[PDB]
Structure 1
Amino acid sequence: MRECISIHVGQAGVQIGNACWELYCLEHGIQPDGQMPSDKTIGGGDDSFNTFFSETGAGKHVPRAVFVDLEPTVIDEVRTGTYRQLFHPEQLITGKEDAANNYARGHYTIGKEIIDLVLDRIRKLADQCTGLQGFLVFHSFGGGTGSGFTSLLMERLSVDYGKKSKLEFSIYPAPQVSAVVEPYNSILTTHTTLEHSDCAFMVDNEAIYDICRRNLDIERPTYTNLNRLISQIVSSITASLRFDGALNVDLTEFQTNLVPYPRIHFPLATYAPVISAEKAYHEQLSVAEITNACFEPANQMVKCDPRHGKYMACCLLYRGDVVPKDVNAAIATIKTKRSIQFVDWCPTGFKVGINYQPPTVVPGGDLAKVQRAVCMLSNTTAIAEAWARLDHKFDLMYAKRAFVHWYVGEGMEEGEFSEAREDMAALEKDYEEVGV
C-alpha cells in the first residue's frame, strides 16, 4: 500500500480540497467525526483507502492532506466546517496576509517566509508513510498563492522528494467567475512548474460554469456549485488510487498511460452525465450514450475541439453499472461516427477502468444520483487552444507592461515575464508539431 499526500494551496485549492474530502468520506463510509464502522482493522491496515487516510488508535481516519493559504479566511472554514473533526491543526497552515493576486508576492516575498513551515508539516505526513508514492497538488492559476506559492512548493518538492510523482489539479482562469492579472500569474506559474509536474489536470472555470448553467439549470452558479462538480471529476480520477482495481493504481501509471512526452502532460477531462437533481424523473443514460458524450465539447473541463487535434492517449474511467461488453460496443459504434485521429507514433486504443460503485453525490446537492457515469482522460493536442487563448491575453497586457510594476516591486524582474512567455511559445510549438 503506497500512500498519497494531497496538498491544497490558495482559496481555490482549499475550497476544492474541502469538497473532495467531503465526497471521499461519503464514498468510503467515513462519518464527519473521522471514523468508519466498516473498517475492521482499527488503528491500522493497508487497504486501498488507506492510501488517502491514516488511522489513529481511536479508529479515526485522518486525511493525508495539507491545507496551505496565506490568509486564514478560507482555511478557517475547514477548522469550523462539518468535517473539522477529520483534520488536526498541524495540517492547516495560514499566513497573515495573502498575495493580492500577485505571483511575485506569493512566490518570492511571502513564499520565502512560509515555505520551510509547509515542508515541515508535509514531512510529518511523509514520515508517517511506509511507501509514499507522491503528491496531488490543488491550486488556481490566477490566485497569487495558487500560482506563486505552488510553483515554489513544486520546486522544493522536486528537491526533497526527487523520486516521487507529482500531479496537479489546476483551476484555469475564467473571466465569468473572477482579477485582471490572472493571465500573468498563469504563464508565470506554468513556466516555473512545468518541469516539476508529471501530470496536470486543467479545469477551466468557464466550462464548469457553463455545465452548471446548462445541465443543472443553475442560473448563477457559485463556487459551491462549481466545487461539487469539480470534486466529482477529481473523485473519478483519484478513484483508482483508493479502491481495488488494476488501472491507474499508483501515480506513476498516470504518467505511463497519459503522458508519452513529458512537457505535454495536460490531459483533457470529459465527464458525463451531469444531471439536475430537481429532475426526479430523468432517463438513465446508457453506456453508449455517456461514452458518446465524452466526445461532445460541451462536457469537457476545457472548451476546445478535439476534432482538430490528435490523440496521444485515451483512458475511460467508468463508475457504476457498466460491463466491458457495453463499452466495446459503445466504442465500436463511436469510432465510425466521430473524428478520432491518434498520432502516428502511438497506438489507437482505449484503456478502460470500471468501478462498480455508482458515483456518490452530496446529500442535498445539485447533481442527481445516476446509475453510471464516465470520465474520459484523453491527451489531445486540442487543449493547446487554452494555452493560445491565455498566451494571447498575456501578450496584450505585456506589450504595454500593464501591471508589471506590481511584480517588479515585489522582487521579480521583467526578464522572468519574457522568459516565461518564451517557454509558453515553445510549449505551443510542441503541440503544433505533435498535431500536424
Structure 2
Amino acid sequence: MRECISIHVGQAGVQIGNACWELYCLEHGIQPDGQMPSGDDSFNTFFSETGAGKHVPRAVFVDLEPTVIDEVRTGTYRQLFHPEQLITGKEDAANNYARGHYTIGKEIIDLVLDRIRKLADQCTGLQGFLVFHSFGGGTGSGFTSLLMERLSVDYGKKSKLEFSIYPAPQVSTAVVEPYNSILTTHTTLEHSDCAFMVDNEAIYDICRRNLDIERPTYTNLNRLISQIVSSITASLRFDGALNVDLTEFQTNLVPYPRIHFPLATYAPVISAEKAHEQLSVAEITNACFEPANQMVKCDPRHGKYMACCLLYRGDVVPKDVNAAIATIKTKRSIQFVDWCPTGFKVGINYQPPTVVPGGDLAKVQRAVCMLSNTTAIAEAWARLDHKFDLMYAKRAFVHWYVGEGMEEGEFSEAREDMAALEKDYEEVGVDSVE
C-alpha cells in the first residue's frame, strides 16, 4: 500500500539517484546487499521485499549511454538493484533534446515502460512516480519528456512529481542547455503535477559558503541534494507525529495545475569540520526565509507566497513548531496572496537527518525543509528564457534539432508556453477585485 516508484533519467538523474538510495539505505538500516538486520513498516513504500528477506528499491535507472549506470552495476550498491531495473542504451542524446525524445529515445522507450509496468504491478496502492533528471542533458530533457507523455497514457492522472536540475555555468553546463530546458518544460508541463527545481548555482554556493568546499564536485552537490530529497520523501518512508502523504503535498502546494513549482529551502546546513550549540525549532524555521539556504536563486522577499509546507525531522514537538509559525505569521515582510486565508501545512518525523560517513554535513538534532509556492520562482524561468532568446534570435544551434525531425514551430510554441507561464505567475500575484 501507498507505494512510490522512483525513475532516474540521464547522468544527473542517475547520479542523484545513487546519493538518494544510499541515504535511504542508511536511514532504514538496509545494507548494500539489500539485507536488513532486524517496528516501523513505512519503508515498504520505497522498498519491495523478496522471499529471502532482500529489500529492493522500487526504482528504475535509465540512460541512453552505459558508462554512468555501469558505475552503479560495479559499485558498492550493485547488489541492491536487479539488473532489469538498470537500463542503458549504446549512444547518448549528445545534449540534443530531439535525440533523447525522438531519434535515440524511441529505441528504448518500450523497454523502460515494460520495466516500470513490472514495478507497478507489484503495487497494491501506487501513490505515483518521482522523476529525477537534468534540464540540460539530451536524455534528461528529451527522454524524460517522452517518458512523461507515455506515463500519462499508461497511468492517466496518477501523480508524477519531478526533481529537476536547473543549469548553472559554474557546474559543467553545455551551450544548448537553455534550449533543452525550455523544450522539456513545455512538453512536460501538462503531464507533471509538481516539480522541485534544484538550481546547480544555489547548491554550489551552499557547498562553498556553508560547507567550506572551495571547488564542489558532483558528489558534494548530490549529497546535499539527497538530504533535501530525503526530507521531502521522509513523510512517505516513516510514521511520524504528523504525516504528509503524496496527495496531501500537492493539494496544499499547487493552487493551479500550471503553477506547480515549489521553492525548497533547507536548514541547517553545517560543516562537519565546524567545531557549537544546537539550533532551536524557531531558529531553523526562521532560516527557511533567508535566501542563502534556497535551492533556486530568486527573491521571495519581493514576491508573494501562495502556500508554505514545513517538513520537520528529528527532535521536534508541535507546540514549538506552532510558536515558530505564529511569529512568522506576524512578519509583514512575508506576504501571502490575498486569496489564501491559511497557507501552512506541517509535517513532523521522529528520525533525525542521517550523516553519510565521509560526508560534508554535520550531525544535527533537528532539521526542516520548507516547500513554498512563491511567485519569485518565475525569476528562474525569466533567466532561462532570456538565454533561450539570445540564441534563438539568430537560430543558433537550431539546425541540430531540425536535423533530428523537429520543426522551428516547436521552438516558438515551447517559448510561447514559457511566456504564458511567466504571465500566469504575474496574474496569480495580483490582488483580487473588490
TM-score range, shorter chain: over 0.9
3-state SS of paired residue (2:400): helix
How many residues are treated as equivalent by the alignment?
A: 428
Task: Identify which range, 420-429 or 408-417, moves more after superposition.
Answer: 408-417
Q: CA deviation at 1:222?
A: 0.4
Q: For residue 288 of structure 1, report the CA deviation from its aligned partner.
A: 1.1
Indicate yes or no: 2:155 matched with 1:197. Answer: no
> C-alpha separation between the residues in 1 aligned to 2:233 and 2:221?
18
Report if the CA contact (8 A) 2:243-2:348 is conserved: no
Give, in angstroms, the shift of residue 283 of structure 1. Answer: 2.4
Q: Distance in 2 between matches of 1:6 and 1:381?
A: 28
What's the CA shift string for 1:305-330, capped at 9, x where partnerless? Answer: 11111111101011111112222222
Question: CA offset at residue 336 of structure 1?
Answer: 3.3
| Identical amino acids, percent of aligned pairs | 100
Q: CA deviation at 1:287?
A: 1.2
Indicate the residue corresponding to 1:41 in structure 2. none
Give yes or no for contact 1:268–1:380 (8 Å, CA) kept in 2. Answer: yes
CA distance in 1, matches of 2:119, 2:326: 46
Q: Is the 8 A contact 2:241 2:349 kept in 1?
A: no
Match of 1:231 in 2: 226
Kept after mapping to 2: 8 A contact 1:248/1:254: no
Moved more, 252-261 or 201-210: 252-261
Determine if the alignment matches structure 1 residue 94 to structure 2 residue 88.
yes
- State whether residues 34 and 55 of structure 2, in contact with CA within 8 Å, keep that contact through their aligned partners in structure 1: yes
Answer yes or no: is the 8 Å Cα contact 2:160–2:193 preserved in 1: yes
Q: Does 1:405 align with 2:419?
A: no
Superposition deviation, residue 246 in structure 1: 7.1
Aligned-partner Cα distance in 1 for 2:242–2:77: 30
CA distance in 2, matches of 1:294, 1:219: 24
Offset at 1:46? 9.9
C-alpha distance in 1 between matches for 2:422 and 2:194? 17
Q: 1:137 to 1:247 in 2, by over 3 A?
A: farther
Conserved 8 A contact 1:3-1:131:
yes
Q: Name whichever of 323-332 and 214-223 sits farther off.
A: 323-332
Alpha carbons of 1:249 and 1:296: their partners in 2 closer, same or farther (altered >3 Å)? closer
Q: Is residue 63–residue 139 contact of structure 2 (8 Å, CA) maintained in 1?
A: yes
The structural deviation recorded for 1:251 is 2.2
Q: How far is 1:286 from its partner? A: 1.4
Contact 1:135 1:167 in 2 (8 A): yes
Mapped partners of 2:18, 2:106: distance in 1: 26
Deviations 1:14-46 (A, max 9, x none): 0000000000000011011101123xxxxxx99
3-state DSSP of counterpart to 1:348? coil
How big is the alpha-carbon RMSD for the aligned residues of Structure 1 and Structure 2?
1.4
Is the contact between residue 381 and residue 431 of structure 1 (CA under 8 Å) also seen in structure 2? yes
User: Using the alignment, how far apart are the partners of 1:216 and 1:11 within structure 2?
Assistant: 24
Counterpart CA distance in 2 for 1:145 and 1:163 is: 24
CA distance in 1, matches of 2:156, 2:348: 32
The equivalences for 1:259-298 within 5 A come to 259-280=254-275, 282-298=276-292
Alpha-carbon deviation of 1:47? 2.6
CA contact (8 A) 2:244 2:347 kept: no
**Runs of 5+ consecutive residues of structure 1 not aligned to the other structure:** 39-44
Quote how far apart the aligned CAs of 1:398 are: 0.3
User: Residue 299 in 1 paired to residue 283 in 2?
Assistant: no
CA distance in 1, matches of 2:400, 2:364: 48
Residue-by-residue CA offset, 1:37-62 (whole Å, 9 max, x unaligned) = 23xxxxxx993111100000110000
Give me the whole-angstrom Cα distance separating, in 2, the residues matched to 1:155 and 1:64. 21
Tell me the TM-score normalised to structure 1 length: 0.96
Decide whether aligned partners of structure 1 residues 250 and 351 sit closer, same or farther in structure 2, where only a CA change above 3 A counts. closer
Instruction: Verify the 8 A CA contact 1:310 1:434 in the aligned structure 2.
Output: no
**Within 2, Cα distance between the matches of 1:347 and 1:62?**
43
User: What CA distance in whole angstroms lies between the structure 2 residues aligned with 1:362 and 1:338?
Assistant: 39
The answer to whether the Cα contact below 8 Å between 2:241 and 2:350 also exists between their aligned partners in 1 is: no
**Once the 2 structures are TM-superposed, how far is the Cα of residue 82 of structure 1 from its aligned partner?**
0.9
Question: Could you tell me how far apart the structure 2 residues matched to 1:313 and 1:431 are?
Answer: 14
Shift of 1:334: 3.1
Taking the aligned partners of 2:277 and 2:211, their CA distance within structure 1 comes to: 15
Question: Do the aligned residues in 1 keep the contact of 2:128 with 2:160 (CA within 8 Å)?
Answer: yes
**Partner SS state of residue 415, structure 2:** helix
Provide TM-score, normalisation by structure 2. Answer: 0.96
Cα deviation, residue 105, structure 1: 0.9
Q: CA deviation at 1:247?
A: 5.5
| Residue-by-residue CA offset, 1:352-377 (whole Å, 9 max, x unaligned) | 11112110110111001111110000
SS at the partner of 1:367? coil
Could you tell me how far 1:331 is from its partner in structure 2? 2.1
- 1:71-119 Cα offsets, whole Å, 9 max, x none, are 0111011111111111010000001010111001111101111110100
C-alpha distance in 1, partners of 2:242/2:201? Answer: 30
**Equivalence map 1:8-47=2 (5 Å):** 8-38=8-38, 47=41
Q: Is the 8 A contact 1:3 1:129 kept in 2?
A: yes
